[PDB]
Amino acid sequence: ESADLRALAKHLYDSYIKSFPLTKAKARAILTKTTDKSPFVIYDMNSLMMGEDKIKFKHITKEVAIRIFQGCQFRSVEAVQEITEYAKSIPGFVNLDLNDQVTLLKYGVHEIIYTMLASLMNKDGVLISEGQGFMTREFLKSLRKPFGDFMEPKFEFAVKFNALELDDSDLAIFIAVIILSGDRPGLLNVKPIEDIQDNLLQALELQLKLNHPESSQLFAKLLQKMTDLRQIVTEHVQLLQVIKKTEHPLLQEIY
Amino acid sequence: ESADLRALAKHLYDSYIKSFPLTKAKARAILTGKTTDKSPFVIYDMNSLMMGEDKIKFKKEVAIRIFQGCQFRSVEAVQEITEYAKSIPGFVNLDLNDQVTLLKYGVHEIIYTMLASLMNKDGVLISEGQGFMTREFLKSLRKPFGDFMEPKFEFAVKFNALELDDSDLAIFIAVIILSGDRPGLLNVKPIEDIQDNLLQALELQLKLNHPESSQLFAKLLQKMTDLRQIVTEHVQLLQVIKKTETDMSLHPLLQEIYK
Ligand SMILES: O=C(O)[C@H](Cc1ccc(-c2ccccc2)cc1)Oc1ccc(-c2ccccc2)cc1
Numbered sequence: 449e450s451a452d453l454r455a456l457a458k459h460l461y462d463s464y465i466k467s468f469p470l471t472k473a474k475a476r477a478i479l480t481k482t483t484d485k486s487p488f489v490i491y492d493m494n495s496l497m498m499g500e501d502k503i504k505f506k507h508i509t510k511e512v513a514i515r516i517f518q519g520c521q522f523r524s525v526e527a528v529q530e531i532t533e534y535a536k537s538i539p540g541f542v543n544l545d546l547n548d549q550v551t552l553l554k555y556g557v558h559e560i561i562y563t564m565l566a567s568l569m570n571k572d573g574v575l576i577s578e579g580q581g582f583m584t585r586e587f588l589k590s591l592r593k594p595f596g597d598f599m600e601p602k603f604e605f606a607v608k609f610n611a612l613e614l615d616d617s618d619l620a621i622f623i624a625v626i627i628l629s630g631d632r633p634g635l636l637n638v639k640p641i642e643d644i645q646d647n648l649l650q651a652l653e654l655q656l657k658l659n660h661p662e663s664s665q666l667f668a669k670l671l672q673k674m675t676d677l678r679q680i681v682t683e684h685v686q687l688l689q690v691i692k693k694t695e696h697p698l699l700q701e702i703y
Numbered sequence: 704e705s706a707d708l709r710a711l712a713k714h715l716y717d718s719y720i721k722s723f724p725l726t727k728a729k730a731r732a733i734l735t736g737k738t739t740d741k742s743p744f745v746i747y748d749m750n751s752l753m754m755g756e757d758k759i760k761f762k763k764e765v766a767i768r769i770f771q772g773c774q775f776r777s778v779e780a781v782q783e784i785t786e787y788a789k790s791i792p793g794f795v796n797l798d799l800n801d802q803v804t805l806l807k808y809g810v811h812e813i814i815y816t817m818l819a820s821l822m823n824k825d826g827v828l829i830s831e832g833q834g835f836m837t838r839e840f841l842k843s844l845r846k847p848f849g850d851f852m853e854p855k856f857e858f859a860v861k862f863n864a865l866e867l868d869d870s871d872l873a874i875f876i877a878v879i880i881l882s883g884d885r886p887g888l889l890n891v892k893p894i895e896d897i898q899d900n901l902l903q904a905l906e907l908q909l910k911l912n913h914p915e916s917s918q919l920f921a922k923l924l925q926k927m928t929d930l931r932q933i934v935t936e937h938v939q940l941l942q943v944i945k946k947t948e949t950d951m952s953l954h955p956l957l958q959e960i961y962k
Binding site: 608631646649650653664665671672674675676678 | 884899
């Protein structure tokens with residue numbers, strides 16, 4: 449009851465904090481008050497360089513649009529690990545069948561990645577490199593044939609997701625819910641997964657009603673965003689199927 | 704007040720009864736063939752199919768004929784849903800183009816929600832319950848047509864496990880129509896205001912009608928995700944058919960819906 453749910457919410461929030469470096473509270477302040485370490489801004493082809501020499505980019509080893517895609521892959525691999533480690537703090541997650549843990553992570557990370565990408569996006573761009581940088585939405589659409597429409601649909605999703613004004617303590621439970629789905633293809637013991645998600649869902653409801661007592665039916669609106677999230681992932685993989693018709697060995701292995 | 708949501712629950716339920724002639728209650732009573740109140744005739748092959756006219760109201764190869772008569776039912780369901788929508792409070796007050804956008808995008812999502820009420824894992828009622836067409840028979844039909852109903856069965860089997868009755872669905876169907884995220888809406892905010900009320904009424908309803916079913920509300924909303932994928936598979940499958948058989952006509956209403 450209240451105490452029990454509110455303890456898990458606290459637990460998940462604490463865990464969410466130390467698993468994820470760039471929190472939403474942090475990214476929003478960096479974004480459109482707390483002006484003290486304003487980030488470098490990539491708004492066009494000329495500011496993309498310099499940036500390279502000014503940011504501590506870790507993926508540079510060749511077209512501009514491909515090298516931005518590849519940088520987005522590197523970052524995705526990092527977040528998989530951060531998500532993986534957060535997953536392991538969700539009560540009951542590690543006690544599940546190991547194959548099921550792997551399946552849940554496998555089919556969940558993309559959904560979680562775009563959820564949290566929203567936290568770093570406004571309608572004019574997205575933070576990059578732990579917030580030391582900013583890539584404008586306009587510069588991204590202007591990129592080559594298949595690449596210019598890779599991150600527009602995430603921008604579109606983010607504006608409608610951020611309009612819910614969740615905070616991290618909201619997002620922590622929300623992400624738990626996503627991982628502990630239960631309809632992921634090929635699960636062996638759905639019952640403990642759904643059991644856990646049921647718990648997480650209960651904790652999310654309470655969390656939203658206390659943290660947003662004036663946002664009516666917010667729980668239901670948040671859950672409704674899962675349909676947009678899955679269509680986004682579904683559309684994302686198809687543009688990946690076209691990229692395998694455009695372009696390392698050991699590096700191609702890492703992805 | 705709870706009491707206003709309950710009255711909205713009753714209103715929508717009563718209008719569901721009036722616009723949908725084959726309820727889930729009727730369908731369940733037919734499907735559980737332990738009630739000889741009128742049992743269905745069962746189509747499972749070419750020969751049962753051909754006998755299916757001497758015995759059922761039944762107005763080109765086998766696959767065509769089956770999906771020509773499924774097109775009829777589909778446009779007829781569009782009208783029934785369309786009639787149900789006008790009964791949702793506030794719906795007819797919205798901008799006319801919004802009204803048209805809501806039906807455009809909600810209608811198939813509702814057709815497969817309600818198709819589950821006609822389905823068990825084994826097959827689906829047809830011709831207003833008089834008939835029953837097995838899942839295997841549908842899955843066996845020619846290269847493109849056979850790939851059509853199987854994803855509805857898969858959804859229906861899971862969705863049916865929620866054990867919703869007609870009063871639950873009436874509210875759920877109303878929430879789907881009044882989304883607000885549909886592409887191209889002019890006044891999103893009055894749509895969300897109604898759906899906000901619809902969602903409140905659904906939540907209370909599930910809590911009251913299914914007291915032991917924890918988080919059935921949330922679980923039901925998650926299902927909204929399965930619906931939209933099915934629309935997408937179906938549509939892209941529909942695009943294969945118009946190129947395979949250029950002699951075959953999709954009904955104009957359903958054409959207009961698909962964009
Ligand atoms: O897209 C639509 O509106 C419908 C949705 C649908 C509606 C009803 C059923 C149904 C199927 C069996 C029994 C009862 C109902 C199945 C699907 O799906 C259709 C699929 C194929 C057709 C079609 C029409 C003419 C020629 C070929 C295919 C029409 C509709």
